[PDB]
Amino acid sequence: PEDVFSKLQRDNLSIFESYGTALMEVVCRDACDGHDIGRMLALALLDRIVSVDRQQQWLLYLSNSGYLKVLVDSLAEDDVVLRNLLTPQPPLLKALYIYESKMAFLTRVAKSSQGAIELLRSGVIVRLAQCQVYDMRPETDPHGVFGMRETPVFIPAPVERYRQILLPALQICQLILTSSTAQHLQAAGQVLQFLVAHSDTIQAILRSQEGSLGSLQELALLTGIISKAALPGVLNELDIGLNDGSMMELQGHIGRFQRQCLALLNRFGGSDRLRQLSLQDDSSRLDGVSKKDDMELAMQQICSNVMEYCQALMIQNSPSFQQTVCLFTPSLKESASRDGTRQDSQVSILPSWRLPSLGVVIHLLKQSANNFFTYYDIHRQSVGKLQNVEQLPPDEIKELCQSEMPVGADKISTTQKYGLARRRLVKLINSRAKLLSLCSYIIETCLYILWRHLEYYLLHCTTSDSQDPVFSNMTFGNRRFQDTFNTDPNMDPRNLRQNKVSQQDVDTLLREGANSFGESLQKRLLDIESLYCKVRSRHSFIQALVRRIRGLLRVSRV
Amino acid sequence: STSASARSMCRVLDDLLKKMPMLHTGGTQTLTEFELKWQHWREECERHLQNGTFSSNVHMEAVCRVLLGDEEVLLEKRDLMTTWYHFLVSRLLFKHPTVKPTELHFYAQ
């Protein structure tokens, strides 16, 4: 039976509909032209009404009356004011809260397939690509490790204000790519133009060595935009009359974003994850527990999005089974060297120009399979605590309360303590449920990519030592090129085709593949499918890929 | 249709004019993707001129030099434009198709 809240929401919507265009006009005008606080509340009201409007009447009015275009066009005026907020002594944060309310409302409109189309028609991505505030990334001063300025708790740091500006723009871009399934190429093309307009800032995010929660959220959103926007088919069907020079620059930026996204798998898909999570346990025991769960979620989301990108690149470049793009080198050695407890080898920073090894995919698969059981047990314990909250020890209720309210948890009523404890348990359950879904998706996608690379290297790769020396002499002879000139303009950029794989590399891949994908990992992967995939309608995909990979690794080449 | 000797050159010039990148007021194309296509098209025009493709017809050669934004040939065609602001817009079309509002005064002057 229809829940009482859904009945009341429908009946409330019918009352909004009875006041018609007069109410719509007042709220839309106050959202565009009102005073600072009035604009913020009118935009929050529009976010709420459009969230319940199943018939999209308010969205149709906002588009047809041009208010949606005025709200988008005013982002260029906000840019001038938002730049002034990045100064060490900002003016009043009023423009930031108006921008947040505006971007939250546009993000809400972008959740419907129709609203994403109307936002692309109003030019939202084009106006975002014109805003210079995104290029004003504050330099993180590394010398603040020497103490004694109590930063006054009331003004967010310039880096945090920059994130309050950038994260909503990235969220809209990611949402438009997710909701626009019928116009995916035009949406992807405009979002690519935004990524190219701010390409230095985007490369700075992708290169960031910081382990802060904010830098991980920037990386998680940006990798999820690149995974959806940077599709090879978007460049060939953009009938936008770009001169040949501008297409070469566009391909150049995409090829850099690609290499940098793949380099993130080496950082977050490996042993360095455990060291980044441990180096922050020492500086504050009371504020650290919530930030750890969200950092862990953001790191898993980065790995998921880069694996989604690898999957999408393999699906689109394969109209035929013989033409697989090889994203990973045929080495598994990296998976075997990282199981050892040796803490003291100096960082071989692999340069961002080397392709990751297939060993990284197997290590990520093993790690995601282990983390799945840990998240499953914590999720089950947290659900049991939520059912029995009134039976919890007062010390556990205090720990749950202090995590949502650091100041003053001792002055609140017992009823308020149980309410804070329930909220923390629900956040914990939902965060762990998302980690379980990400681990399942990473496992599925790692198995797919591993299967496709083993299929290519074991069945389709021509080795550099097969056939044969017959005829032609000619001699001579050493020396030196310095200098000089001339044009031939036929550099077709299809030259990613020369990784000379040796027969020794393939034989090592077969032997290391059988050892690294052993019966213990295969059993755990089948146990995960039995615990998780029974309840969500994808029966047998993990079992099918495990059988195919087991097939390929048992083929002795005849 | 009339000139059998000019027909090969007319086909090259028709193809250059047909392939010319145009901006559209509702395209998903970025200004950078447009600039790259426009540069590649301009290199195709320049290659045809350097190869002497039009050397038997001064008028087709002049039209190809106009497509390259040749300022001497644009000024030789002053009488067809009649105004300096038509000359400005022709220069912007063939040299600076991605011109910004902030740069207009410099090009106008």
UniProtKB/TrEMBL annotation, chain A:
Residues of the full protein shown: 1454 to 2011 of 2011
A cellular component term, taken from the record's GO annotations: nuclear pore inner ring
BP GO annotations: nuclear pore organization
Compartments where located: Nucleus
Name of the protein described by the UniProt record: MGC83295 protein
Listed GO MF terms: structural constituent of nuclear pore
Keywords: Nucleus, Transport
UniProt keyword Transport, yes or no: yes
Origin species: Xenopus laevis
Family label: Belongs to the NUP186/NUP192/NUP205 family.
Superkingdom in the source lineage: Eukaryota
